[PDB]
Amino acid sequence: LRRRLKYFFMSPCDKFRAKGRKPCKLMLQVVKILVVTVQLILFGLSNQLAVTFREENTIAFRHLFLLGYSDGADDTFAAYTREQLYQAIFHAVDQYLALPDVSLGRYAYVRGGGDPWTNGSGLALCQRYYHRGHVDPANDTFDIDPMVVTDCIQVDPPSYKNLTLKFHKLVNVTIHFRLKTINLQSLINNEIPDCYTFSVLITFDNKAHSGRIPISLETQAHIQECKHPSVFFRLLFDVVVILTCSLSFLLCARSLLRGFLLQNEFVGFMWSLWERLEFVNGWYILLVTSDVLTISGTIMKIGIEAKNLASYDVCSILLGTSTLLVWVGVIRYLTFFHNYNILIATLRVALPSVMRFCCCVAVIYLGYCFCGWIVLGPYHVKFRSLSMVSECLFSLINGDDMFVTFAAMQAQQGRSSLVWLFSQLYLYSFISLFIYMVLSLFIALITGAYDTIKH
Amino acid sequence: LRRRLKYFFMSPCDKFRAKGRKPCKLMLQVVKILVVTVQLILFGLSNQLAVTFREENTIAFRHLFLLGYSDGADDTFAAYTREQLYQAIFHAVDQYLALPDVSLGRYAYVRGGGDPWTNGSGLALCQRYYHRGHVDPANDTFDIDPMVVTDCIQVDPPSYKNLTLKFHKLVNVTIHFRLKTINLQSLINNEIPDCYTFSVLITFDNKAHSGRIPISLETQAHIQECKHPSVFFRLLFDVVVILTCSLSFLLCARSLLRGFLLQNEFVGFMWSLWERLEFVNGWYILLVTSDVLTISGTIMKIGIEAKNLASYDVCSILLGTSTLLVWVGVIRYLTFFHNYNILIATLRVALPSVMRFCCCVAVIYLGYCFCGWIVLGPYHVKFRSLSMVSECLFSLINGDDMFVTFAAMQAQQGRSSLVWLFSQLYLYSFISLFIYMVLSLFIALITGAYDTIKH
Amino acid sequence: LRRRLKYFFMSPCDKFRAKGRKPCKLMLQVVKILVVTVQLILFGLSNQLAVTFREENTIAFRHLFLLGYSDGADDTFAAYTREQLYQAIFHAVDQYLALPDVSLGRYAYVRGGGDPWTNGSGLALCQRYYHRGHVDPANDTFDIDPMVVTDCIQVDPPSYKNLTLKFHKLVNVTIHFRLKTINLQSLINNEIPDCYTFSVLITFDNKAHSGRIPISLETQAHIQECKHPSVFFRLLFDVVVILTCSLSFLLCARSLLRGFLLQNEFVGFMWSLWERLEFVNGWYILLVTSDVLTISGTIMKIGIEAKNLASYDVCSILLGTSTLLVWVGVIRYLTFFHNYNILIATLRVALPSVMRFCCCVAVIYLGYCFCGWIVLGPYHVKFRSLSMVSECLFSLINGDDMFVTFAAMQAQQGRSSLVWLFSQLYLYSFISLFIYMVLSLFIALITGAYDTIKH
Amino acid sequence: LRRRLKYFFMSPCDKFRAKGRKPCKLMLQVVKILVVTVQLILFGLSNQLAVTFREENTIAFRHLFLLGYSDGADDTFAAYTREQLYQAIFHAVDQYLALPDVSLGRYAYVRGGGDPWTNGSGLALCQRYYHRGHVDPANDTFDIDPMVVTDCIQVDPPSYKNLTLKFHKLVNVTIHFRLKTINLQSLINNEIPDCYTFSVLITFDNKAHSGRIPISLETQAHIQECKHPSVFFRLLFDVVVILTCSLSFLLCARSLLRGFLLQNEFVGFMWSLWERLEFVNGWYILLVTSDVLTISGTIMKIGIEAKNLASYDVCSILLGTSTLLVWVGVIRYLTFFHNYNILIATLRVALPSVMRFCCCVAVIYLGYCFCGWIVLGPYHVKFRSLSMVSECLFSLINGDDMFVTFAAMQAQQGRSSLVWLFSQLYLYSFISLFIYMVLSLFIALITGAYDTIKH
Ligand SMILES: CCCCCCCC(=O)OC[C@H](COP(=O)(O)O[C@@H]1[C@H](O)[C@H](OP(=O)(O)O)[C@@H](O)[C@H](OP(=O)(O)O)[C@H]1O)OC(=O)CCCCCCC
Ligand SMILES: CCCCCCCC(=O)OC[C@H](COP(=O)(O)O[C@@H]1[C@H](O)[C@H](OP(=O)(O)O)[C@@H](O)[C@H](OP(=O)(O)O)[C@H]1O)OC(=O)CCCCCCC
Ligand SMILES: CCCCCCCC(=O)OC[C@H](COP(=O)(O)O[C@@H]1[C@H](O)[C@H](OP(=O)(O)O)[C@@H](O)[C@H](OP(=O)(O)O)[C@H]1O)OC(=O)CCCCCCC
Ligand SMILES: CCCCCCCC(=O)OC[C@H](COP(=O)(O)O[C@@H]1[C@H](O)[C@H](OP(=O)(O)O)[C@@H](O)[C@H](OP(=O)(O)O)[C@H]1O)OC(=O)CCCCCCC
Ligand SMILES: CN(C)S(=O)(=O)c1ccc(S(=O)(=O)Nc2ccccc2N2CCN(c3ccc(Cl)cc3F)CC2)cc1
Incomplete structure (x- = not known):
């Protein structure tokens, strides 16, 4: 029993000297570092394409729809007079109606589809104000029913000019519309372009009632597969990553099982749940966790490439964390040498x-x-x-x-x-x-x- | 006596083992951390509302009244020609007269009420210059009586265009006016809006006589209760904080009294004012101070909510300091264990x-x-x-x-x-x-x- | 043998006391520090002149050819409407044609000389787009042949106004032209001015197809000798540097040879390739390397001054590295004294x-x-x-x-x-x-x- | 002798206990800290007034004379076309001629007084170019005589419009003029205003011949006493500082003399120039130096207040250094106590x-x-x-x-x-x-x- 226990804690070189055992786990770890890092970079290409498309379209929307907008002014962009506010609102709507003639991008309108749009409507211009709003600072008095009333004007894609704002009880003004576009840049990565729908919300916010109304534009992007497109290896590499991580998982599980059996034997031979844990390899727990994360991320990546999923952020987190863990896990073999540990x-x-x-x-x-x-x-x-x-x-x-x-x-x-x-x-x-x-x-x-x- | 002294310095667990004493102080300390932190956050809501109202109104005033003002230019904003100065002054006054038609806020004018305004006057435009001011750099000479003379023009809310500045002996130009508004955003916090009076001072400063006249706008805000408003729990939580801190104060005072009595007994039994202080619990002094601060801040907070006080800054300092002290005071119970101390x-x-x-x-x-x-x-x-x-x-x-x-x-x-x-x-x-x-x-x-x- | 080995490791003062040997190497090292540093500064004069000429001309090109450009905007400069893009393109071409009348610099046009210019053409305006580009986001469909087709318009120096951009399948637009100028400022350094050719590339990049088209200008500078110019010491100093470094190299090589001979004798007299290396002076290896670098840099500097070479960056790196090594190498003589080592x-x-x-x-x-x-x-x-x-x-x-x-x-x-x-x-x-x-x-x-x- | 030496190195308390000696030096040091710090602050008032006058006038000049100048643009301000350069030059001259009507400051013109101005001339507009300047980049050739020729146009205060710039061989353009003004703000400090002459130099620099011509404005300020002005304690405090520092200097010199005498006696009684220096008090050397600096600075300050000198920077350096040394010198008395030293x-x-x-x-x-x-x-x-x-x-x-x-x-x-x-x-x-x-x-x-x- 003593000989077997002594062998259990020997280093790969020592185990080789004893039983000629091949260091399969170490070679697997090196191969894993290489392939997992390469896979992460290859995924990063597609991830960057998606993020860039969203961000660049949003910046273009800010320049197209916000009157007098310039880069870096997002935090301070605001209106200060009634005339400024009306001009900003009307400029946004006019640019929406002129988009096909002026924009460098190619966008398609979306109509209907539920609130806040009626059927056939592309743009919703809504003002929200207090139900009852008498405000008389001259006499230091007011009479308010703070229930919010929403009034919306619908604009079809190619009356809103009669908008009358109730300034003294105005809570906010919003402009809602959706645009469809195609992420053509994916062709550079030998991928089929996706179809994006951008939900655009422009807010003129008066909740502070302070004489300053900040103006913001935000977008939500929804990715969908296009309908029967036509364009005039990563699957195998992902399979290789899966197989390497699966073999590593199996070997580590076998090692953990043998450790558990040896712990049981040692405890039994003793004619505290702290000395038993000395039979548990924490590095192998880490390797098993990293294998699980890598395989999950690879399956998710395959799903995204097949266009069944679009969860780029979750996939990136899984693959990046697994890459870091794979790099870290090779330290297990430096623990056998004091100078390196x-x-x-x-x-x-x-x-x-x-x-x-x-x-x-x-x-x-x-x-x-x-x-x-x-x-x-x-x-x-x-x-x-x-x-x-x-x-x-x-x-x-x-x-x-x-x-x-x-x-x-x-x-x-x-x-x-x-x-x-x-x-x-x-x-x-x-x-x-x-x-x-x-x-x-x-x-x-x-x-x-x-x-x-x-x- | 030795047994009693040894019991005095025992830890809560040890005191329990000796006399079964319940650790009431420790539980009170934990409850205090929870309730005091929650109270501080709840107060922060109202504090933020007030500060935001003041700041946003001031920024709006800068944009409304300062010709060609833009964000971030406060430190360098200045006039450099006579024409620029006159245009800035007249723009400020014209915007004051046009405020009801152009501003996104709802403001009321204030008239009279003492200097620098005459009765019925809303805006005071004052120029201050030397009593006698002959300045002849061509002959390297001057004749100055530096007594400051003030000349003011009064403008009623809806002659100042004939202003003639004595440039060569001008000390400064000021514009003074007051505006009344209502902080409606408080409705979002289920509070009754207050009535604010902003005192606005615009300064064109020529004290350096350097050919550059910096221009600034400053405001002073005075909060008052409105007159019989109409709008179509924190008091109990404050009471709970008061009761927790009062019970803690009483228990700590009792402990300090017992410590003083034991010190007197020990000194008497000795048939230096440094060994006696070893009977004084500094942590209990800290806890008593924190209880006093917490109760004072809570009373001030209740007064502010009732609209008897408006001292948000003092209340915030009291409650924040008491919160920090309450969090710190729980270390008293880690002092009994070397590894944690x-x-x-x-x-x-x-x-x-x-x-x-x-x-x-x-x-x-x-x-x-x-x-x-x-x-x-x-x-x-x-x-x-x-x-x-x-x-x-x-x-x-x-x-x-x-x-x-x-x-x-x-x-x-x-x-x-x-x-x-x-x-x-x-x-x-x-x-x-x-x-x-x-x-x-x-x-x-x-x-x-x-x-x-x-x- | 023991006496000779003991003498080998003696300090310069000890070697003087032993055999009266003059410290020639130390004096050479000090002289080298002085002359190499001076040479580096003198070279820096010419290097700065070249770099400044290139950079200043590029900034001037940005201001001349990019519509509405201002300093600091390079990272965000972009077009957002079709009208903006057309105006930017036409402004660049018009300014190219107007350069002789408006520019503060004196530039000459370059014609022909291969792609993308035809013979006699000075400016090439090229648009690159997909061979087949049907894009229909309204129906969520597309039909793309991603082969890039280039269409170029040639402009002779003193038709391009009919340019029709295929926006929906546009990959990018480029403007290519070359300008010749003379770096006259070299006269201040008593040098003959060189003839520069600037290759200017202006890119309107649509590869993201995002509705935002960034605009950039880049230049490549080619330096040539002018044809028989007329204008109405460094060579000797470079020669002195060469001679100092050559003498130092020879002395260090002699020392290394003697060390190798002594190592051979010591090994032979012993009736491990780690004790032998104790006979190798690493400082002398460093000095030999620094001499080689200094001489190479000096030869390159002479070639540049003679106008046979124009590799300012490589020469600067060689001379700077050699200067640092020369300064560092004098520490060899502080190693003999514990307090200084x-x-x-x-x-x-x-x-x-x-x-x-x-x-x-x-x-x-x-x-x-x-x-x-x-x-x-x-x-x-x-x-x-x-x-x-x-x-x-x-x-x-x-x-x-x-x-x-x-x-x-x-x-x-x-x-x-x-x-x-x-x-x-x-x-x-x-x-x-x-x-x-x-x-x-x-x-x-x-x-x-x-x-x-x-x- | 042993007793006297032991007394020599005693602390002030020990010397008091030995001979009842009063700690006059320590009291003097405390008083010195107080009075020297107060004097430095009082001087800082006048120093700030002077620096502010110069800086503010320079900023005003930049705004008045540089076409399209704005704050923060000094490093990049430049011209890029011939039209821009001509407009900038003519704007500077026109503003110089219009100064009495447009400026918020009161300035007087200066005429004649040597180069570059002729007698009766207020402004000099000079262009500097090569004596012979044939530049032909088209043929890669040039013929240059780099001797600089200056051509100046003189403008009297209330022909320069015919200026023809030789662009291809232009070295630079300069505008020189002087303005007189009075620093009235000194009245706030109960001081008589000085008469300032500003020498203004505007440079359009073409030394790089790069198509970009940077534009800068610089001023030199000369302060003089005005001629018999009329305006409808610091001298005593400076005298007090002088007396305190003089008494301190005398006492420290006496201590150093006694130390030297004791060193001589000790050396003589010994029947190395390192043990002797143990008789030298370095702190007293520091105190003597600080007294000298303080007195020099105080005399200079009195001279400046009397308007015999205008060297504010030198005086400020003297007084600030002496203040730091005075604060530092009190550490001498903490050297006697190990815990504080x-x-x-x-x-x-x-x-x-x-x-x-x-x-x-x-x-x-x-x-x-x-x-x-x-x-x-x-x-x-x-x-x-x-x-x-x-x-x-x-x-x-x-x-x-x-x-x-x-x-x-x-x-x-x-x-x-x-x-x-x-x-x-x-x-x-x-x-x-x-x-x-x-x-x-x-x-x-x-x-x-x-x-x-x-x-
Ligand atoms: C009897 C138990 C069930 C049957 C087990 C059959 C063998 C099996 O599964 O793996 C053996 C090794 C394991 O490779 P690997 O895990 O690297 O090797 C083991 C480890 O070195 C372990 O130490 P730790 O790493 O510190 O825990 C050690 O105790 C074992 O010795 P022991 O055997 O005396 O206990 C080794 O076998 O792997 C191969 O030799 C090729 C793997 C497949 C390659 C496929 C290529 C396409
Ligand atoms: C005879 C003196 C006058 C009468 C005193 C009557 C008792 C009284 O006041 O508090 C007793 C404890 C105190 O609770 P607490 O202060 O936590 O407990 C005391 C501390 O542990 C103290 O040690 P330090 O904390 O290190 O100073 C220790 O010496 C005392 O033992 P000793 O008694 O043998 O001296 C403890 O009684 O508190 C309750 O048991 C409930 C409190 C009210 C809960 C209300 C709920 C609605
Ligand atoms: C027998 C071998 C072949 C012939 C060698 C002939 C001599 C020759 O070459 O240099 C001698 C010295 C060397 O100058 P330098 O290198 O400074 O001096 C040597 C080093 O100090 C060396 O120690 P490390 O520096 O620690 O290695 C030491 O062992 C040698 O002693 P040793 O001779 O007993 O071995 C010294 O000669 O240099 C001159 O005295 C003037 C140089 C030219 C000046 C020209 C001015 C225009
Ligand atoms: C016999 C030598 C010539 C005649 C000297 C006559 C005395 C004179 O000059 O100063 C005496 C003290 C000095 O004041 P101060 O310098 O503070 O005192 C001396 C120092 O403490 C010195 O030690 P270190 O500081 O470590 O060097 C110590 O050795 C001397 O003792 P000793 O005398 O036994 O050697 C002290 O007299 O100062 C006054 O008592 C008032 C000063 C004027 C106040 C004016 C007020 C308007
Ligand atoms: C920054 N580090 C301390 S460093 O990296 O160790 C280091 C870097 C450079 C040098 S230096 O000699 O080249 N000269 C140098 C160059 C530029 C700025 C400062 C200096 N020195 C001035 C003197 N200073 C000093 C002397 C005595 C004491 Cl009692 C305390 C001190 F701080 C040390 C710094 C030395 C060390």
């Missing part, structure tokens, strides 16, 4: 103390996150949302973008002085505490762990 | 040596601050004020925004070469000294303190 | 363990590179290409540009939420792993190596 | 090894500086000059602005691929070597020095 050995020693330290640090970090989000968020562009606040604080801990964070508040030093002073205290205390105390101790834990495994 | 133990060991080190470092830091502020401030955008200089130097110590700091001075290398050379020496010496000597020693102090408490 | 001794001790550590780290780094490039590249401006991804990740490891990297993805939080969440996980995991674990261990290896050689 | 003790121990390390590091740093400056400077905005290259490399060592440095070269990846690859190698090697090897060893030296003096 510093990172993993240090991680194993350090992880418990690091997690215990994080227990204390996380409550402080979260307290700062919530305080900053709510107090500074209305005044500071970097504190708008909780995820943004976490990004800002994490970057500050690493010394990044610090003066700019201070300078964003300098405008409030004259306007809201108390908030400015609080922001000073908040930023100085956070940076000092986390860079000089917390991070130093974190690094000290890691380097001490390394010191214990140095020799 | 590294940060606090290191802080306690390190603080004295760190403060002594700061004694020496602070004088150097302040010397650099003053020197940079006065010598480089007129030439360097990052050295304009003392607080800005401290922000710049602190960021430099952390390696942030360094090349940009150097590059701001590169323009003076041809204009003011001596100042450029001095700035080179200043920046290089500061960065070298503080990053490589001071900060290294600071971190060494902290990690040495950690080394002493490692085991 | 910390860097080299630490490097020698640390290199093996560092390379072994890199073996493990590189696979993780590459996995992250590929995953980020393919998954995030279509959405993130910093992940467009593999080299850019490596630049971004390497900068992140050093704490640089981190918040901006996070913020680039914040736009997708509403559009592509799954990709945004993946980007969050990717960035947080990469930064945490590499800054806090990998880099800490790397630095620990280096400082431990230094600890071993401290005394 | 960590920084100085560590510096004293570390300096020799640090300087020896710098000997080796500096040659590598300089090699990189020269190589980068010459090879990358023409392509990279951050490598234009040697000082800029040093700024960039120093910032990179601290991890600052790294991705931007990489990204500046990404444009050459298609244009000049070899230079791009070299830049990749250069940047990666520099950053790796200096951040991970050099800086780590530097910090290790400093922290080891601290370790030696820890106890």
